[model samples]
Target: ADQLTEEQIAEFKEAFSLFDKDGDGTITTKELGTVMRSLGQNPTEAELQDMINEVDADGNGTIDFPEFLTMMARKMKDTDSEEEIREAFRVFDKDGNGYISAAELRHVMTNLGEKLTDEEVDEMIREADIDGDGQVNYEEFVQMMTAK
Candidate 1:
C-alpha cells in the first residue's frame, strides 16, 4: 500500500478478483490475453511469459496479489468505470459504426478539433487497433482513452 492509497488497494482487490475470473488466486493466459490485447500487443505465449515474469517477484511464474499491486500501479489506477467509458465510446463512434474508424478519428481530431494531420490519425489507429485496421472497438477505445 506504499504506492497506492488505502482506497486504491481496496478497489484493486475487487479489480484483481474480477481479473482472476476463475478464482485461482493468480492470473494466467485467460487474463493475460485480455491485458495484452488491451495494450494492443497481441503478444506470443513467450512474450506473455516475459510480461508476467517481470512482475512475478516471488518467481512463481504467475501473478499473485503482491505482483498485481505493482502491476496495477504500472498501468491501472482509480479511473472511470467501463460503463461510463462505453458511453464515451458511443460518442466517439458518432457515425454509428460501433467502432472508431479513420474517418471518425480524422473528424474528431480535426473537428472537435486539434486539427491533427493524417499521420497522427494513422498512428492513433495503429496504437489502438488490436486486430482491426484503421478502426478501433470499445476495448481499444478504452485503452486509447486511458493510455498513459
Candidate 2:
C-alpha cells in the first residue's frame, strides 16, 4: 500500500474529530451517540452500547484515534491496493480535469449498478467532498471510502 501523505493524515484526523467530543484523546459510546444525535438520527441506547463493544480495541470502554484508523483501514487491506486506488481516482476524475466532480460521481455510481436519486447522489458527493470544492480529490475520496 502507498503511504498516506501528511495532508491526507491531517484531513483524516479532522474528519475523525467529528466523533471525538469533549476534546479528549479518545471517543466513548456517549460521544458517538452525541454525534449521531447531532446528525438528527439518534441511535438507540442498545445500538450505541453494542457498537462500543464491537469497536473498542482493548476492552477499555473507549476508542482512541489509532484504533479507529485501524478499524477503518481493515477493509482496504482485504480488498484494495495502490493500483486500485489510483484507478478509482482516475475514473472519478471525469472530464479528465484531474479532479473528481460531483457529476462524475453520479456517473460512476450509475455505472456500478447503484440507482441513486439525484438527491441521494448529491448528498453522497457532499459528504465526501471534504475540501468544500464541490468535488472530491484523491485524499478526500480515499478517506471517505476507507472510513469504517
Candidate 3:
C-alpha cells in the first residue's frame, strides 16, 4: 500500500493539513472529529477514539502523517461496485447532467436513518467539490465515495 503516486500523496497531505488544525504534524481526536464532520461524517466521540486508536500506530493517541497516509491508502483501496455506485449517483444526479447538487445529496443522505442540516450538506459538497465549481461531477462523486 506504499505505492501512492505523487499526486495522491499531495492530496493526502492537503487532507492532513486540513485536519491537523494545529500545525503540530499530528492529528488528535478532536481534530479528526472536526474534519470528519466537515466531510459529512457524524461520528461519536467514542467511535472517534476507536478510530484514532486503531490507526495511531505509536499508541500516542494521535495520528502522524505517515500513519494518516497509511490509513488513507487502506481505506481508499477497499472494494466496491462501480455499477451500483454509478446507479446511486444516477439517482442523485437526476438531471443527467453529469453533476449533482446539495439538495439531492441531502435528500439521499437523509433517506438514511440520520438527520442532516443545510450546513452539513453544504459541508459535504465542499469536501467533494474539489474543482471549485461548487458542484459534484461523477469523478468527484466516485472519488469522495471511495475515499470516505
Candidate 4:
C-alpha cells in the first residue's frame, strides 16, 4: 500500500482521538464501536476483532496511533459501492424493517436445514449489536461485512 499523505495522517490522528475516549493514546474493541459509528458504520464483534488483529501487529489487543493509521489507510482504499452493499443487506433483512434482528439471522442462517444453538445465535447478535440494541442495523451490517 502507498504511504499515507501528511494530510491523511493528520486526519487519522484526529479520528483516533475521537475514538480514544480515555485519551490514553490507544483504542480497544469497546472504543471501536464509537469509532465505527462515527464513520457511519456498525461492525460486528468479529469484525471489530478483525480490525484490531489486523493492525495490532504486536499482538497487544489494542491499537496505537501507528496501527490505527494503517487500518484507516487501508479502509480508505476499499472499493465497495454503497448501492451494492445495500442490496446485499436487503437479502438478510427478512422483515424489511431496515434492521436484521437476531431472529431473522437465525432463520436465514438455518434456512438450508443447518442448525445453530441458541447460545451461538445470541453470541452472534452480541458481537454485532454495537449499540446494544439487540439488532444489527444497516450501518452495522455494512461495516461488519465490508470493513477490512
Best by lDDT: 3
Poorest 10 consecutive residues by lDDT, candidate 2: 1-10
Residue-level lDDT tens digits of model 3 in 3-82: 56554665466667667776788889998887666554567999788877877888987899888887776655645345
Candidate 3 backbone collisions, by pair: none
**Model 1 clashing-pair count:** 0
Alpha-carbon runs more than 4 Å astray in model 1: 35-47, 76-148
> What value of lDDT does candidate 3 attain over all alpha carbons?
0.70
Candidate 4 ranges with C-alpha deviation above 4 Å: 79-148
Could you tell me which 10 consecutive residues in candidate 1 have the lowest summed lDDT? Answer: 75-84
Residue 43 lDDT in candidate 1: 59
In terms of lDDT, which candidate is stronger, 1 or 2?
Answer: 1
RMSD of each: 14.6, 11.2, 8.3, 13.3
Which candidate number maximizes TM-score? 3
Give the true-structure RMSD of model 2. 11.2
All models: lDDT? 0.64, 0.63, 0.70, 0.69
* Alpha-carbon TM-score of each model against the true structure: 0.45, 0.45, 0.56, 0.52
Candidate 1, residues 1-148, lDDT tens digits: the string is 4676554565456546545656789988658666445423355778667768778888877898878878766554435345545665665687887788888766644543244567766765766577865688887766643524
> Which is better, 2 or 4, measured by lDDT?
4
Clashes of each: 0, 0, 0, 2
